[PDB]
Design a protein around this ligand. Sequence first.
Ligand SMILES: Cc1cnc(Nc2ccc(C3CCN(C)CC3)c(F)c2)nc1Nc1ccc2c(c1)N(S(=O)(=O)C(C)(C)C)CC2
Length: 125
Amino acid sequence: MNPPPPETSNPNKPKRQTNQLQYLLRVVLKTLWKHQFAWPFQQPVDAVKLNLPDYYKIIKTPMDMGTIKKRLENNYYWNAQECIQDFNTMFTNCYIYNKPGDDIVLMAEALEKLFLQKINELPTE
Ligand SMILES: Cc1cnc(Nc2ccc(C3CCN(C)CC3)c(F)c2)nc1Nc1ccc2c(c1)N(S(=O)(=O)C(C)(C)C)CC2
């Protein structure tokens, strides 16, 4: 059985719109979403469908771009670093579950390099 997906709404947490959070949605998330390599990362890993019974035994902090998109839309992050951490979790999860040189790993590495290039242009705090 898959776990419930990550929470994406926190109605009691204060909310703010900032230049950095807007950029993370409209530039960073949007660019990664549209990359040819994005599809495996756009929704939670369906370990039942993929027949990966060990996935959620190994990966205890799952994260995906669909969740990150919803969190940005719902103002779930107060600080830009919370969102960056989620992207980093998604990439490292791929490296943890898989092995160096696997196709999925090479795909995540390319997405991570593009991510870091976009974060290099994050608007000033
Ligand atoms: C976020 C993430 C992290 N880690 C993995 N690992 C992983 C390991 C083994 C297998 C199966 C797959 C290979 N055969 C078929 C038997 C063993 C696997 F499906 C995934 N998947 C992920 N997502 C993800 C989602 C959907 C799909 C994916 C991947 N693929 S895919 O094969 O990776 C690709 C993209 C075509 C290269 C198929 C569709």
